[PDB]
Ligand binder design. Structure first.
Ligand code: CLA
Ligand code: CLA
Ligand code: CLA
Ligand code: CLA
Ligand code: CLA
Ligand code: CLA
Ligand code: CLA
Ligand code: CLA
Ligand code: CLA
Ligand code: LUT
Ligand code: SF4
Ligand code: FES
Ligand code: CA
Lengths: 157, 97, 743, 81, 42, 221
């Protein structure tokens, strides 16, 4: 018995299968994430994305920036995370602008892991990428807002 | 010195005399038994051949396998005939394999 | 099957005819020169044995006798050291007062005013102060007169002639055959139990009978001439029993198993000798006894001729699992047919060992009066770090040579090698990533610190005063090493070293031998810099080894050899794809890493370890202790280390340290001279040589061996050689002048 | 030295290891242990005279092992009680 | 012995000997006439 | 043919033509496979012969004085051990008619004259009975076999003019030589460990066995 096998029995594709890339727990997990929910509206997935990442990007700008000890300005450093959200969503927008055109199908793969046809993932559109952009951005700014809302003392403010 | 040379050839087998300080090719050029050459510089395999007896000086020979000089093949145009030799001509491809 | 001696008689005949025909070994060189390139090739391929021929027997015979030649050379160098200690030295006066006389075993002739280099080293003597630490070894050996040094010089000369004769003999008269060399089990059994076991047993013997009593007498205060000769201690034993009562029972315990009764001179103390600043000799003798026992037992593992033992093939074949397929099956066939695989493993291990030796010898000083001799300590640490780095890089060179010339899955297939070859892409990807991440988070902190210190924002720095990064695990481990003696080591009294802690400080002659070394934010930063440099060097060398045969860019690279310039300017340009070029690039990065290591050690020791102590007990360090607060920015390294400590070497003109001032500048020159070879290419040079040759032809003075420009690979090699020489020699002069001047 | 002290301990130790090595129950010159579970057979070529194929090499090996093991447990017991 | 005479005339050995002799000559000259900045004779 | 610790490797080449051939070679030194310098088996047999001969001589000589130190008018100043006659000056020396260094040079000169010629017989068998040597050449012809040269000199009495003769005598010779070699090794390590002399040691053991061997492991000096 051996644990590593070529990807789907094809030993001439440039990859392998491991307990890291093809494992039931990892497969199910990575499947149930927004980026891998193919049959779902781009905007909902983007919403999840922006929520989680604004909330996460709150902490570091607060606890490490130049005014970390000045607290007449320490907590309101969420301005910075809002600005970072704005900047990388501008970047999302220009990436989608350059990578796609509406009058062209979505470049995603049409086959699945076993050899059945799928309806190409629409996130790789121009339309749906702009939709996902709006979703991520909405979520990012309001997630910044949410994690700034919880200023109540917990364990480490 | 000027040992006698023997060359099997599709034309037959002929002998010519020629000093040891010379290359075989110009010496078959002297008496006039035509042989195939391209380079005259020891950097191709048109003048290739193998030996029946004796052995030929291959000091100034190059572009050869680290074996082509230990199992028979020789380039006629950069070769000094140290002995009364007996050699082959038109031997490029069974050398080319 | 069985093990025996196997030899041929008179394989090659002693003659001079091959000396007069240069390049006899290679058919291409033998033909003779047309151009000057010949002369270079003649030297570059001189010791490439497995390229002169195809036969493994011949390569092994050549290797064996070449090893004998190297040993003869080493013996001659030892003979010189002992003769110079005996004849042109102040060793006896230093033996009389070690903490005032600075050692010196080289004098110069008065030829052009150079006698100024014969400086006042104390003791009625004028010469060059040496830093190899030989006086400390000779004192730890028991040597007390120059007659013993003469005797050892003569013995070493004899041994050198013997080695040279054996080198001639095993190549020309009695040359062993391949089956003799290819017996690795008997070889390992002999080197483990015979060379290392019997060696350290014999040495433990010498320490028990000579070094221990003579050093006891010397530390008691006795005049080094009124001490008995060593052999007296062997003839009359009451002399020994006066210093160690246990020598009265005399081997009755060793049999009665009451080894306790030897606790006289076989101890387990730990810590330093507070009289000489070195390890207890009664600890070193006991150590060597234990090591000899361990090795003598370990040299009885492998089966040779009597059934009992272990077959290496069996051990390797037994190990395999579900992640590695069949692994270790097929490594015995490989490790017995290629010299390059063996050389790579051996070089890797010996380089790592040398680095470990550097650390352990600074931290637990073995010789007496070495810890307070600061120049010798600096010299030894630095020397051994450089040697270790070089050997580790050679390991990569010969792994690459094995991959290009010897690896062959058609006749010698191993699974593990094949699997690593089959995921090299992921390997190199992850290593690349971790080096980038490690470089951002260590050097980046320095850049942040410099910018915060220049912007008048020191409260935003990464330091002990503003934002602390304490190495908790290192502090935790040395705290565990402090509490060890008595809790997890009930048999020890003091702990292994004084750097662990416990508040114990050792002084000698008003100087500091050792004390606890403090770890802080600066130590954290420096260590992550070190991890960064080692990871980068590894990336370069391992990329060179793993892709030595083929790539996505050049799919038949193994057919171009191990050392080739390129595969042309196409495909975008393919300069330096060979594995030789990867070794060439890794040498620069090894230089970088080792240089930073020796700078970190040199500044840290002066700042928090070395110095002078007062009778009241207030330690004044050589530098003021400024490593904790100035090492955290780059400006502090440029200002407080380089600029401030180069003063000694830029002010030595007119003194006896002026040779260091001359070598400083010469080394800068050689370094800058290499950049010309590194930054240019040979096309320009050959075209310039064209016109110079014209000028010579104009006067019927042109040479017949046509001058050429150097090879592409030779250009790279000359460049890296002069770069390394220049840089290392600059640091050599700086260190030696600085450390000798202050003390 | 001989009496009832170290003598008893070391003698019984080396004696039991020799008794093991002669018979089975232990790797030996004519016995190759596979992985610590069982033993195979092998004629080492070295001729002996003992009916059980007990070589001098075997005797030396098991004697050294008896001495190592006896020295170990002697020093232990006399260092703890 | 003839082969030795040839070998001794190979380039590195010949240059080694030539320069060692030259070095001895200049060394002895400077040991006899030290610190010369000019031609003090004529 | 009794065998001692023989093996299928040693018992291959040890057929039996040699005296005292017991098939004992647990290290395989006589194996003729890969033979070179000073490992050739003929030289090893010759070396055993010469070692044993010199050992008989030296082992009887190193004990003779201190035995005649006890019986007769033999003066005790000329009754020393074998280690306190000058062999190890840090252990006792004497004042002969020469220096002990002039003695070394002169003894080396005489033994050079002897041993160079014995070797030259080994190397080119039959060389020495050809060049002039003031006479003294008619007797140094040889017998084809190095270790048994014969002649008018090395065999005056004419022992063993047949084959059984020579084989039986050769066996006894090599066996006694081995015994004396063992004895000399014992001399060395006894005279170190107890440090008194082999005859005195024997006479100190014949009385009581209380201090036979393990007693002296205290190694006084
Ligand atoms: C050349 C122009 C420039 C300017 C004007 C600034 C200005 C500033 N830098 Mg900056 N920097 C620059 C170049 C510049 N930087 C470059 C080239 C580098 C690379 C070396 C850096 C790297 C750098 C670092 C690492 C940091 C700064 C920080 C800061 C802020 C410190 C003062 C402060 O605390 O403000 C007040 C505190 C605030 C949080 C103000 C936030 C600004 C608004 C609210 C963000 C809104 C963004 C908006 C939605 C859209 C973004 C831009 C848009 C107009 C396109 C300040 C506003 C520090 C900082 O504060 O991090 C944010 C800090 O961490 N800079
Ligand atoms: C107890 C046995 C013994 C000992 C002590 C050694 C010792 C050594 N071997 Mg060796 N070897 C042995 C058995 C032994 N070997 C066996 C059984 C085999 C296979 C059959 C080999 C095959 C082998 C190879 C292929 C090589 C060595 C090498 C070396 C040297 C390693 C470098 C070094 O550390 O130098 C340390 C230096 C010293 C300790 C200085 C003292 C030197 C003493 C006198 C060495 C004498 C030991 C030697 C076995 C004497 C036998 C010669 C005798 C017949 C006259 C070293 C001196 C390397 C070598 O030959 O370098 C020349 C090497 O290439 N050995
Ligand atoms: C291979 C190393 C070595 C060597 C050559 C020697 C050699 C010697 N030891 Mg020794 N010894 C050694 C290691 C060694 N020792 C070690 C490691 C220990 C510690 C266990 C001892 C402890 C020891 C004791 C207690 C005595 C000797 C003694 C002696 C001398 C007695 C003469 C003899 O009988 O033999 C002798 C010259 C005896 C002596 O001192 O004679 C003067 C003595 O009584 N040794
Ligand atoms: C046990 C150590 C060891 C051994 C036995 C070998 C053996 C060998 N190596 Mg190797 N190597 C080693 C260590 C070792 N190496 C280390 C530590 C490195 C890292 C630097 C390398 C890197 C290396 C490379 C890159 C190559 C080899 C190659 C070779 C082969 C040919 C070497 C040769 O003859 O070139 C000839 C030797 C010279 C021309 C001498 C060079 C002189 C140097 C450059 C000057 C040094 C300056 C000096 C120290 C001080 C200045 C003095 C001056 C001012 C007067 C040979 C089998 C070559 C090969 O092709 O393998 C098949 C190859 O190219 N090695
Ligand atoms: C895990 C950390 C650690 C380490 C590195 C050591 C290291 C050491 N201990 Mg120790 N010990 C430890 C934990 C540790 N101990 C703990 C948690 C306890 C219980 C409190 C002890 C109790 C203990 C005692 C009572 C003694 C030592 C002794 C020793 C020293 C001799 C080692 C030895 O006996 O060889 C190894 C022995 C073997 C049979 C090999 C086994 C291989 C190991 C177990 C794996 C050695 C330096 C001895 C000493 O004091 O030396 C002077 C001793 O007397 N230790
Ligand atoms: C020290 C290891 C050792 C050695 C070297 C020998 C050697 C020998 N044994 Mg022995 N043996 C040993 C251990 C050893 N044994 C052990 C541990 C036992 C179990 C107690 C025996 C039980 C044993 C028996 C029962 C006999 C021998 C016999 C023999 C001899 C057979 C050869 C012979 O005489 O004719 C060739 C021989 C000299 C046999 C013998 O004496 O010959 C008749 C025989 O009867 N052995
Ligand atoms: C069955 C009876 C017996 C008894 C009661 C003892 C009792 C003892 N033995 Mg002992 N021993 C015995 C049998 C016995 N032994 C036998 C049969 C052998 C031979 C196999 C040994 C071999 C032996 C050695 C070699 C040592 C002891 C030691 C000890 C003492 C402390 C070891 C300890 O616990 O610390 C704990 C030890 C550790 C935690 C080891 C950790 C250190 C390792 C090396 C680091 C891990 C790195 C690893 C290499 C990876 C202890 C009083 C030690 C001693 O000499 O006491 C002074 C010692 O080193 N014994
Ligand atoms: C182009 C560079 C250059 C020049 C022009 C000089 C010139 C001189 N150097 Mg100098 N030197 C140089 C480079 C140079 N050096 C370098 C690079 C170094 C470092 C290695 C030195 C180190 C150096 C030292 C240490 C010394 C000199 C000395 C001298 C003076 C020697 C006079 C002499 O030898 O007497 C006369 C020699 C002859 C007449 C020889 C000719 C006779 C021939 C053989 C016979 C022919 C007969 C027909 C001279 C003026 C010496 C001096 O006295 O300084 C004042 C001296 O001490 N030099
Ligand atoms: C080659 C073997 C050999 C060697 C090297 C020696 C060497 C020595 N013998 Mg010895 N001896 C030997 C064999 C040997 N003997 C034999 C075979 C016997 C008869 C069994 C003796 C009986 C003997 C006696 C009785 C004495 C010596 C003595 C001596 C010492 C001085 C002899 C002398 O003055 O020269 C010879 C000078 C001549 C003029 C002749 C000397 C170290 C003498 C001695 O030193 O007393 C302790 C002493 O009296 N020997
Ligand atoms: C068989 C084998 C094989 C296997 O395989 C392995 C093994 C086991 C190893 C082996 C071996 C074994 C052994 C035992 C060996 C040994 C030998 C010997 C002992 C010799 C001696 C040998 C010996 C010898 C020569 C000796 C000699 C001696 C002499 C002369 C003496 C002299 C002297 C005298 C008189 C006296 C004086 O006063 C001194 C002197 C001067 C000193
Ligand atoms: S010749 Fe030089 S520049 Fe051109 S491809 Fe090769 S290495 Fe590069
Ligand atoms: S013509 Fe091609 S080799 Fe002479
Ligand atoms: Ca042999």
């Amino acid at each position: 018995y051996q644990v590593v096998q070529p990807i789907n029995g094809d030993p001439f594709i440039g990859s392998l299968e491991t307990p890291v890339t093809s494992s039931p727990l990892v497969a199910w997990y990575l499947s149930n994430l927004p980026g891998y929910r193919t049959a779902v509206n781009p905007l909902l997935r983007g919403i999840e994305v922006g929520l989680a990442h604004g909330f996460l990007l709150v902490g570091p700008f607060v606890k490490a920036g130049p005014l970390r000890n000045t607290e007449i300005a320490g907590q309101a450093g969420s301005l910075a995370a809002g600005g970072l959200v704005v900047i990388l969503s501008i970047c999302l927008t220009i990436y989608g602008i350059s990578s796609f055109n509406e009058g062209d199908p979505s470049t995603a793969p049409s086959l699945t892991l076993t050899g059945r046809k799928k309806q190409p993932d629409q996130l790789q559109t121009a339309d749906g990428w702009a939709k996902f952009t709006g979703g991520f951005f909405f979520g990012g700014i309001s997630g910044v807002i949410w994690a700034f809302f919880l200023l109540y003392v917990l364990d480490l403010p | 010195a000027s040992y006698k040379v023997k060359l099997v050839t599709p034309d037959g087998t002929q002998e010519f005399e020629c000093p040891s300080d010379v290359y075989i090719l110009d010496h078959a050029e002297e008496v006039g038994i035509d042989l195939p050459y391209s380079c005259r510089a020891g950097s191709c395999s048109s003048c290739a051949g193998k030996v029946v007896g004796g052995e030929v000086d291959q000091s100034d020979g190059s572009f050869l396998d680290d074996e082509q000089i230990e199992a028979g093949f020789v380039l006629t145009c950069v070769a000094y005939p140290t002995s009364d030799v007996v050699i082959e001509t038109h031997k490029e491809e069974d050398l080319t394999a | 099957p069985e093990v025996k001696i196997l030899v041929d008689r008179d394989p090659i005949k002693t003659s001079f005819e091959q000396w007069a025909k240069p390049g006899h070994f290679s058919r291409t060189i033998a033909k003779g020169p047309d151009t000057t390139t010949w002369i270079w090739n003649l030297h570059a391929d001189a010791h490439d044995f497995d390229s002169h021929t195809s036969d493994l027997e011949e390569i092994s015979r050549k290797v064996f006798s070449a090893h004998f030649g190297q040993l003869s050379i080493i013996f001659l160098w030892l003979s010189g050291m002992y003769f110079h200690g005996a004849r042109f030295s102040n060793y006896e006066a230093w033996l009389n007062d070690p903490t005032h006389i600075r050692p010196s075993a080289q004098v110069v002739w008065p030829i052009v005013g150079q006698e100024i280099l014969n400086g006042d080293v104390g003791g009625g003597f004028r010469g060059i102060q040496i830093t190899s630490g030989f006086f400390q070894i000779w004192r730890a050996s028991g040597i007390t007169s120059e007659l013993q040094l003469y005797c050892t010089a003569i013995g070493a000369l004899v041994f050198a002639a013997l080695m040279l004769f054996a080198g001639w003999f095993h190549y020309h008269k009695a040359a062993p055959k391949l089956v003799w060399f290819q017996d690795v089990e008997s070889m390992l059994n002999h080197h483990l139990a015979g060379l290392l076991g019997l060696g350290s047993l014999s040495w433990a013997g010498h320490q028990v009978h000579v070094s221990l009593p003579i050093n006891q007498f010397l530390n008691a205060g006795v005049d080094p001439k009124e001490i008995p000769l060593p052999h007296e201690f062997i003839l009359n034993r009451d002399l020994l029993a006066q210093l160690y009562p246990s020598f009265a029972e005399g081997a009755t315990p060793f049999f009665t198993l009451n080894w306790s009764k030897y606790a006289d001179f076989l101890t387990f103390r730990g810590g330093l000798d507070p009289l000489t600043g070195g390890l207890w000799l009664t600890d070193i003798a006991h150590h060597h006894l234990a090591i000899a026992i361990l090795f003598l037992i370990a040299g009885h593992m492998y089966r040779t001729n009597w059934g009992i033992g272990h077959g290496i093939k069996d051990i390797l074949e037994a190990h395999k699992g579900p992640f590695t397929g069949q692994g270790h099956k097929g490594l015995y066939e490989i490790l017995t047919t290629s010299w390059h695989a063996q050389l790579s493993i051996n070089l890797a291990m010996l380089g790592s060992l040398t680095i470990i030796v550097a650390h352990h010898m600074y931290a637990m000083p073995p010789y007496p009066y070495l810890a307070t001799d600061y120049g010798t300590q600096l010299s030894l640490f630095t020397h051994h770090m450089w040697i270790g780095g070089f050997l580790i890089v050679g390991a990569a060179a010969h792994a690459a040579i094995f991959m290009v010339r010897d690896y062959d899955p058609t006749t010698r297939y191993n699974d593990l090698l094949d699997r690593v070859l089959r995921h090299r892409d992921a390997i190199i990807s992850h290593l690349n990533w971790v080096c980038i991440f490690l470089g951002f988070h260590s050097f980046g902190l320095y850049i942040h610190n410099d910018t915060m210190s220049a912007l008048g924002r020191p409260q935003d720095m990464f330091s002990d005063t503003a934002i602390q990064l304490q190495p908790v695990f290192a502090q935790w481990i040395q705290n565990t090493h402090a509490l060890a003696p008595g809790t997890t080591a009930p048999g020890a009294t003091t702990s292994t070293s004084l750097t662990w802690g416990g508040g114990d400080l050792v002084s000698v002659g008003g100087k500091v031998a050792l004390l606890p070394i403090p770890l802080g934010t600066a130590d954290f930063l420096v260590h992550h810099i070190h991890a960064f440099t080692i990871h980068v060097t590894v990336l370069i060398l391992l990329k060179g080894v793993l892709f030595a045969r083929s790539s996505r860019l050049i799919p038949d690279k193994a057919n171009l050899g191990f050392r080739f310039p390129c595969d042309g300017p196409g495909r975008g340009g393919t300069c330096q794809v060979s594995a030789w070029d990867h070794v060439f690039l890794g040498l620069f990065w090894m230089y970088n890493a080792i240089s930073v290591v020796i700078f970190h050690f040199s500044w840290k020791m002066q700042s928090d370890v070395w110095g002078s102590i007062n009778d009241q007990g207030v330690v004044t360090h050589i530098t003021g202790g400024n490593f904790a607060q100035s090492s955290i920015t780059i400006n502090g390294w440029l200002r407080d280390f380089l600029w401030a400590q180069a003063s000694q070497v830029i002010q030595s003109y007119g003194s006896s340290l002026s040779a260091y001032g001359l070598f400083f500048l010469g080394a800068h020159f050689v370094w800058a001279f290499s950049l010309m070879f590194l930054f240019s290419g040979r096309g320009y040079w050959q075209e310039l040589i064209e016109s110079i040759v014209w000028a010579h032809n104009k006067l019927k003075v042109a040479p017949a061996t046509q001058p050429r420009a150097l090879s592409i690979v030779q250009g790279r090699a000359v460049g890296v050689t002069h770069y390394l020489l220049g840089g290392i020699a600059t640091t050599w002069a700086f260190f030696l002048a600085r450390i000798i001047a202050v003390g | 030295f001989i009496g009832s002290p170290t003598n008893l301990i070391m003698v019984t130790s080396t004696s039991l290891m020799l008794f093991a090595g002669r018979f089975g129950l232990a790797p030996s010159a004519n016995r190759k242990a596979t992985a610590g579970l069982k033993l195979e057979a092998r004629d080492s070529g070295l001729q002996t005279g003992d009916p059980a194929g007990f070589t001098l090499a075997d005797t030396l090996a098991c004697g050294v092992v008896g001495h190592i093991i006896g020295v170990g447990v002697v020093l232990g017991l006399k260092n703890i009680g | 012995m003839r082969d030795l005479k040839t070998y001794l005339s190979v380039a590195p050995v010949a240059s080694t000997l030539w320069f060692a002799a030259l070095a001895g000559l200049l060394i002895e000259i400077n040991r006899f006439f030290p610190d010369a900045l000019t031609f003090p004779f004529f | 043919r009794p065998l001692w610790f023989a093996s299928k490797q040693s018992l291959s080449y040890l057929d039996g033509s040699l005296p005292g051939d017991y098939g004992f070679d647990p290290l395989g030194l006589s194996d003729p496979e890969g033979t070179g310098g000073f490992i050739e088996p003929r030289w090893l047999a010759y070396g055993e012969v010469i070692n044993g001969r010199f050992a008989m001589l030296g082992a009887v000589g190193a004990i003779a004085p201190e035995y005649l130190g006890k019986v007769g008018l033999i003066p005790q100043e000329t009754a020393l051990a074998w280690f306190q006659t000058g062999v190890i000056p840090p252990a006792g020396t004497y004042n002969y008619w020469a220096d002990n260094y002039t003695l070394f040079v002169l003894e080396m000169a005489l033994m050079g004259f002897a041993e160079h010629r014995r070797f030259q017989d080994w190397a080119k068998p039959g060389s020495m009975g050809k060049q002039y040597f003031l006479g003294l050449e008619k007797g140094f012809g040889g017998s084809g076999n190095p270790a048994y040269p014969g002649g008018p000199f090395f065999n005056p009495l004419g022992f063993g003019k047949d084959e059984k003769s020579l084989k039986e005598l050769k066996l006894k010779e090599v066996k006694n030589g081995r015994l004396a070699m063992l004895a000399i090794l014992g001399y060395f390590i006894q005279g170190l460990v107890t440090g008194v002399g082999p005859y005195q040691n024997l006479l100190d053991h014949v009385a009581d066995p209380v201090n036979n061997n393990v007693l002296t492991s205290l190694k006084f000096h």
